Amino acid sequence: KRIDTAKRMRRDRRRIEELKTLEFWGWYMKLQRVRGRWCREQGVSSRGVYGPAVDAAELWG
Amino acid sequence: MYARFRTRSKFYFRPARPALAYNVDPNVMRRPKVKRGLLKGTYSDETVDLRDRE
């Protein structure tokens, strides 16, 4: 019985840690879609002090 | 360097005070009842003890 208890206990914690993880990644990708959304109106390139022509060059990227 | 500190000798040598025989202070029946601290010149207003609960 304590064998089966020991395994049953380690199984479902593995289960809910995955629930944690999936929901986490979900929320973080939501976050990133929010950031991607907000960076557009503000006009944030997040490619630095340079204008678009700089990575257009593609020598520097 | 500006201050002046010279070491006190009472810290080097501190013999305990003479104990009483049969709890008799030899001069009780001679001297006055004035608190010794007073005549010594020892006095205070607040005595703040840090061994108190407060």
Binding site: - | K10, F11, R14, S44, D45, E46, V48, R51
Partner: protein
Amino acid sequence: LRKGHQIVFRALEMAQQGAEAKGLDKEHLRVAHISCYPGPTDKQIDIRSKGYYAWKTKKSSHLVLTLAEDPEMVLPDRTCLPYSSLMSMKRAGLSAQPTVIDVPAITADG
């Protein structure tokens, strides 16, 4: 940064409250007497290897502090600033000379 100095601070402050409670004047107070004499003591085990031990003694002292009023006193000025403070403040827009404003003495006609 010394511990003693902090202890003496607590003492100073309390005796200052007391000396103002007695009717004296804060600004003309000065330390008349500061001394310290040995107080009670506690003890502690220090266990040393191979079945040895010694007694660590935790010491404690009594402190005696007397504040006295001294009318003749004149205090050195601490309101002087380093040149740096002066012109940094100038560049900030602050006045380097603090504002005095004349205040009419309190009087009762009613």
